[PDB]
Amino acid sequence: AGKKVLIVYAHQEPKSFNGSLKNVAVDELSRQGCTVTVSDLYAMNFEPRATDKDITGTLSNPEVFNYGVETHEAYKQRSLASDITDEQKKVREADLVIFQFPLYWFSVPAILKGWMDRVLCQGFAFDIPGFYDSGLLQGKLALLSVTTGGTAEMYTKTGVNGDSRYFLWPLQHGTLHFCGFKVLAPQISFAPEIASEEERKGMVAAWSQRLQTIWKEEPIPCTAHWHFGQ
Amino acid sequence: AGKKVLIVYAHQEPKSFNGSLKNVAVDELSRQGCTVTVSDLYAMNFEPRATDKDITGTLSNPEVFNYGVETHEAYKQRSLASDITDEQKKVREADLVIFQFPLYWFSVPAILKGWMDRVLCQGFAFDIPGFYDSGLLQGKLALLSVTTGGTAEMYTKTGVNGDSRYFLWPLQHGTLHFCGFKVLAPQISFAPEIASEEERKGMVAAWSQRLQTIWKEEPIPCTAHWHFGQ
Numbered sequence A, B: 001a002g003k004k005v006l007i008v009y010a011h012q013e014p015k016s017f018n019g020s021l022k023n024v025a026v027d028e029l030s031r032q033g034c035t036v037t038v039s040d041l042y043a044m045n046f047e048p049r050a051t052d053k054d055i056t057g058t059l060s061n062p063e064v065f066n067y068g069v070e071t072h073e074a075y076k077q078r079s080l081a082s083d084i085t086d087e088q089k090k091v092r093e094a095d096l097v098i099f100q101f102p103l104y105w106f107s108v109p110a111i112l113k114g115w116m117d118r119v120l121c122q123g124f125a126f127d128i129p130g131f132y133d134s135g136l137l138q139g140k141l142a143l144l145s146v147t148t149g150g151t152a153e154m155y156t157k158t159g160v161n162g163d164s165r166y167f168l169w170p171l172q173h174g175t176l177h178f179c180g181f182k183v184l185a186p187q188i189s190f191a192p193e194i195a196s197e198e199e200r201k202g203m204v205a206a207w208s209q210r211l212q213t214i215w216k217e218e219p220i221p222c223t224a225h226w227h228f229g230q
C-alpha cells in the first residue's frame, strides 16, 4: 500500500503453473492492500503484430510505412490504437510491473513480445534522451517471473543452455532497463513439469513469501558485468 | 549450386531497408541458380500466438491445455494448423534459412517470434532427446540478417548496448543451434536510418557481395565463449 502493481501474464491455461503464480501474486499483493491489475494477454487475444493498424486516423507518411516514426508521432498526437493506450495507462499507473510467462526459445512467448513491441513506444517508454537510467519509466520497478522446461543445472555457465543470466539480457537490460525501469531480481521457477508436487508447492511459496517483502528489495545492477561477468 | 534457400522475412514496408536486403538476397541467390522461397510474414498476416487453435484433433488432455505437449502430439498425428505445416515444409526442403528482420528490443519482432514459437515444434525441429548437435534440423544452415537503430559503436563491449553478440545468444544458440542448425556469421547492418545514402548502398552491396560466396562459408562455433568472450 498504496502501491500499484500490473501483472502482464502470458499463458493460455488458468490451471497451469504460470496461472498459479499469477494467482498467488494477485492474492498476496491484494492482501497487503496493493492495487493490482492483470493484463491476461491470451484471454484478451492481444494483438502481437506491429502494423499500421496501431495508428488511427491518417498516417504521417501514407507512402512508406515506418513503424517507429509513425508510433512516436501517434503517441504525441494521441492517435494510437486503444488496445495500446489501454496498456500504456495501466503501465503509467503501475509502481511495479511483473511479467509472468513460460520461457519460449530463451525469451518471452510472441504474444508478450508483441506487448513489449507495441506498448513500449517511443515517447511513452523511452526517448532521445531518456533511455537506460533516464528512460521515461524511471521510478518504476519491473520483475520477470519466468518458468522453464530446462532444469537449473542445464542453466549454468558450463551447462548446455548457459547461465540463466545470458538469456535475461535482452529482456532485463535491452528492454526494461532501456525504458528506465529498475529491475528486480528475476524470479525463475525451474522445470515445474518434471518437479514433484512438493517441489512445485515449494516454488509457489518461495514466490508467495518473496512477494511479502517485495517493496523492501534492492534492484539488481542491470549491467553487462551482472549478466555475463565474474 | 543446386541449393534451396528459405528467407523468413519480417518487415511491414517493401520500400524499407530490410525489404532492399531481402530483394538483393532473392536476386543474388536466384542469379546463382538457387531455389528461393520467401515467407513474408506481415504480408501473410502470419499468426504469432501459440493457442489451442494450432491443433485440430482431440487433445491428449483437454482439461489442462499444455501447448508444448499438444503440439508435439499434433505434429506426430499431422493435426497441426496448416499455416504451421506450410512453414515446416519450407524449412524441411531448405538447405539454408535466412532470417531478415529489424532488431526489436534486442530480439526479433513478435511476428517472427511467433513463427519460431509455432513452427519449430517438438517432433519437427527437436525432440527430448534430440537437440543442440542432435537437433532434428541438423545438416541445415541458418543466418540472421539484422538491421539496427543503434550504431556499431553503441553495440560494443564498452558501448551502452553491450556487444552485438550478446543479443544474438537466444536466437543463435537458444533457438537455431538448439534445433540442430549450424549458424553462419550474422549479417548486421547497423543504423541505416542515420547512415548516409552512400553508406546505405555500401551495406546493401556488402550483403549482395557476401551472398556470392555463402556456400563456401563455414559456420561459427555457436558457444558461450563465441558470444560472451571471458
Ligand SMILES: Cc1cc2nc3c(=O)[nH]c(=O)nc-3n(C[C@H](O)[C@H](O)[C@H](O)COP(=O)(O)OP(=O)(O)OC[C@H]3O[C@@H](n4cnc5c(N)ncnc54)[C@H](O)[C@@H]3O)c2cc1C
Pocket (backbone or CB within 6 Å): A011, A013, A015, A016, A017, A018, A019, A020, A101, A102, A103, A104, A105, A106, A107, A147, A148, A149, A150, A151, A192, A193, A197, A200, A201, A204, B050, B064, B066, B067, B068, B116, B117, B118, B174
Ligand atoms: C514454444 C515453446 C518454446 C519453449 N522454449 C523453451 C526454452 O527456450 N527453454 C526452456 O527451458 N523451456 C522452453 N519451453 C518449455 C516451457 O518453458 C515450459 O514448458 C513451461 O515453462 C512450463 O510452465 P507451465 O506453466 O506451462 O507448466 P504446467 O505444465 O502448467 O505446470 C507443471 C505442473 O504443475 C502443476 N501445477 C499447477 N499449479 C500448481 C500448484 N499451485 N502447485 C503445484 N503444482 C501446480 C500443473 O498442473 C502441471 O502438472 C518451451 C515451450 C514451448 C511451448
Ligand SMILES: Cc1cc2nc3c(=O)[nH]c(=O)nc-3n(C[C@H](O)[C@H](O)[C@H](O)COP(=O)(O)OP(=O)(O)OC[C@H]3O[C@@H](n4cnc5c(N)ncnc54)[C@H](O)[C@@H]3O)c2cc1C
Pocket (backbone or CB within 6 Å): A050, A066, A067, A068, A117, A118, A174, B011, B015, B016, B017, B018, B019, B020, B101, B102, B103, B104, B105, B106, B107, B146, B147, B148, B149, B150, B192, B193, B197, B200, B201, B204
Ligand atoms: C518496436 C521497435 C523496437 C526496436 N528495438 C530496437 C533495439 O532493440 N535496438 C536497436 O538498435 N534498434 C531498435 N529499433 C530500431 C529498428 O531496429 C530500426 O528502426 C530498423 O532496424 C531500421 O531498419 P529499416 O528497414 O526499418 O530501415 P528504413 O527506415 O526502411 O531504412 C533506412 C533508410 O534506408 C533507405 N533505403 C531503403 N532501401 C535502400 C537501398 N536499397 N539503398 C539505400 N537506401 C535504402 C530507406 O528509404 C530509409 O530512408 C526498434 C524499432 C522498433 C519500431
Ligand SMILES: CC(=O)NCC[C@H]1C(=O)Nc2ccc(NC(C)=O)cc21
Pocket (backbone or CB within 6 Å): A105, A149, A150, A151, A154, A161, A194, B068, B069, B122, B128, B178
Ligand atoms: C528435460 C526437458 O524436458 N527439457 C526441456 C527442454 C527445453 C529447453 O531446454 N530448450 C527448449 C526449447 C523448446 C522447448 N519446447 C517444448 C518443451 O515444447 C523446450 C526446451
Ligand SMILES: CC(=O)NCC[C@H]1C(=O)Nc2ccc(NC(C)=O)cc21
Pocket (backbone or CB within 6 Å): A068, A069, A122, A174, A175, A178, B105, B106, B149, B150, B151, B154, B161
Ligand atoms: C538510437 C537507437 O535506436 N539506439 C539503440 C537502442 C535500442 C533499444 O534497446 N531499444 C530500442 C527501441 C527503439 C529504438 N529505436 C526506435 C526507432 O524505436 C532503439 C532501441
Ligand SMILES: [Zn+2]
Pocket (backbone or CB within 6 Å): A172, A173, A174, A177, A178, A221, A222, A223, A224
Ligand atoms: Zn541494464
Ligand SMILES: [Zn+2]
Pocket (backbone or CB within 6 Å): B172, B173, B174, B177, B178, B221, B222, B223, B224
Ligand atoms: Zn550454440
